[PDB]
From a paper:
An efficient recombinant PaFabF production system has been established that produces in excess of 10 mg of pure enzyme per litre of bacterial culture. The accessible surface area of a subunit is estimated to be 15 460 Å2 and the area occluded by dimer formation is about 2840 Å2. There is one active site in each subunit. However, access to the depths of the active site of the PaFabF apoenzyme is restricted by the conformations of Phe230 and Phe400. The octahedral coordination involves O atoms from five different residues.
During fatty-acid elongation the acyl-carrier protein (ACP) substrate transfers a fatty acid to the S atom of the catalytic cysteine of FabF. FabF requires a catalytic triad, which in the P. aeruginosa enzyme (PaFabF) comprises Cys164, His304 and His341. An unusual feature is a completely buried potassium-binding site that was identified in all three structures.
Residue numbers in the entry:
A (entry chain A): 2 to 413
B (entry chain B): 4 to 413
Write the structure that this text describes.
Amino acid sequence: SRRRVVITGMGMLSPLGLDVPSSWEGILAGRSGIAPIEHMDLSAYSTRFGGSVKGFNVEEYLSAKEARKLDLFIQYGLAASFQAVRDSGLEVTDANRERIGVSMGSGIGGLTNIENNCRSLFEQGPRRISPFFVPGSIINMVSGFLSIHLGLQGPNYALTTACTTGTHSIGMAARNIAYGEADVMVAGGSEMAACGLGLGGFGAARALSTRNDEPTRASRPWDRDRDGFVLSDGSGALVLEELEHARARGARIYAELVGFGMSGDAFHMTAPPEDGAGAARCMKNALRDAGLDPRQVDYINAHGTSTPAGDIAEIAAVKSVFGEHAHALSMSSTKSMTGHLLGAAGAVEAIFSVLALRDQVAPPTINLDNPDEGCDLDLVAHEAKPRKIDVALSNSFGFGGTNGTLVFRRFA
Amino acid sequence: RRVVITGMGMLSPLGLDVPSSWEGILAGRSGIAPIEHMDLSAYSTRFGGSVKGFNVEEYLSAKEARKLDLFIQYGLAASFQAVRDSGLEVTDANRERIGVSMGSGIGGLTNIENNCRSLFEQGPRRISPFFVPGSIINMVSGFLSIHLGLQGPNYALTTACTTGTHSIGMAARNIAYGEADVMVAGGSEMAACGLGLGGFGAARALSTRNDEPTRASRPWDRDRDGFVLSDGSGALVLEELEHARARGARIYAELVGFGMSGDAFHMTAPPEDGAGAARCMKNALRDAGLDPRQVDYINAHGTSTPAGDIAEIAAVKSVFGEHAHALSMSSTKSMTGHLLGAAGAVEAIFSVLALRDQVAPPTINLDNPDEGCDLDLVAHEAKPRKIDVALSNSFGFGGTNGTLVFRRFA
Ligand SMILES: [K+]
Ligand SMILES: [K+]
């Protein structure tokens, strides 16, 4: 029946760094990765900043010939994946390649490539669309290209669930392993939606912070002066592995993935209900899946995107699920520093949750200068808090009311 | 926990619902024609499978519909159809146990085109406020859950040609695991626009048989020259067996197996031996606890491509051995074209209906079977025959493979 799933490898590109340790160093130091966007002219836009990946060198991962065929979200996804596989120490062979799969997702995918090709179509005609437009832009090609590069022949797929993509990708990949469909999965997500369509689109929806004068203070979850999310880019990948498989090869085990929960709000296209009813049902599903007492939860890495309705819904949901224990645990939003990585958010935040377990420290919610009415939990304001963490949750409560919760536990 | 199919819904190039589409399938009718909605003079391919006469206001108000990309409208239509067909009554007692997994290969290309037009010509402040929510792939699942009040697992797959097949398979897993009693699963696509036809055209992936569009899709025929791009949607209501029995549901068939693999070979062209497709079919059969000899009908991937079609023949021969000549295999894409994200969903429906009616759909246009294509490919005309177990295959871009196994329920 249901086999146990552990984390043996991790990889990442974020607004804070070009790998896991550098990103984590920034997280624990309370550093913002948010800055005015330099790669395009945003003078005509209401938001002119975000979390860019800085100094990415694709030549550390892929030949120039292969890299030019790929949208940045694919480059980022492959980078995080290559890091995670290397980190795991796993040797891929004919004996195991059929048992190793991939589930790397994205919220929007190759929007830069789509936009660029639409410009070519409109101004020059259809014969100027790139032959690599489809294979270089569709969301499943992170899973596609990774499997080809490394010879991974197990289950191969891709989620697209907006803010929840990375969380679903990791959860369902653990389900594959638990079910016996695979012994190893590379899972997570990637995003690069910082183009005219992305910044303009979220801008037209009035979804983004417009705090152009102080970009590092823009992302401020649970603060009374929050005004929308900050768009960020990057990727996270984890190597998930069946427990006995990991033990048999003497793998280093970071943590155990013990629970995964899902729900739908069935409420609104963009905003959650203020009581966070769906989020609460999601966390409850996750806790039951993990066979845990709620009081066992020590740290919650929040969705916390710095939106009026979104942030307050999470407080309400945490209070409903945990009761008086809501005041004993610590919850923080690392999006205060990284901004919102959309399809990659759940992946980088799973990594942060695993590292919170490794290092026994809760990452801060920076910018929490004045908590809003009712936001009176331990939200780890301003600075990292060393504390006991035996169980960590990571929440993603995304566009369309799609909810996912992952439950991680210390392994010994 | 066993999983059964209690409702189905569809938009295809052959009809605006399941029965109309199925009638076309059994008649050998083509849904492919020159594309009318845009000027394709400068394009190498000027035809495909369009949904004709779709009326969204049978499902949604004009205001609701306006914001949503066509792929979402199509996905909602199939989903609404399937839920209605199932007879399920949604209540407070069960709403947290009913979820949605509707996917798409490429999603809102038409809305992206339109908002690009506005961005380039007049700037970012002229992008639609509803662009993002009305264009992102998970919004079929999102909108459906909101409209019907469904609070169970809510997600979306995007695995090109295999989307619909993965969506149905993984929704069945949700039910089997106990995280849901009912799932609405499938896919939708509306990519037969400028970016889609131009994009696949640039990749030289499409048939260019502009002079005879109905003859263009010709799986395993020696003169095939690429796939035909088509629009539409399919949706299935998957239900736990006891749940279905307790409410007296009509059960079309049972979903008994789901298999996956990766080729880890090429972007678009599978290995000639179909090794990945073979592993996938074997995985599906193992999941179902069935021997290859129990399979009666296979609804192929069969997109009408040189490498793709022949890999499937090789895969079927390796998996089924001598029994490969006893079963029937056909590609309904010969009539429907390739619905991309919706292909696996509409083809799961065709497989279920093959079981209901005991008839194998034809592979039309199979005038001259290519070298080695000597199986029973149901050439030209529908074939009544015994069908106890049916497979549906999807072997998609990226080498991503999925196989569903359906069985008669008595
Ligand atoms: K989180
Ligand atoms: K099929």
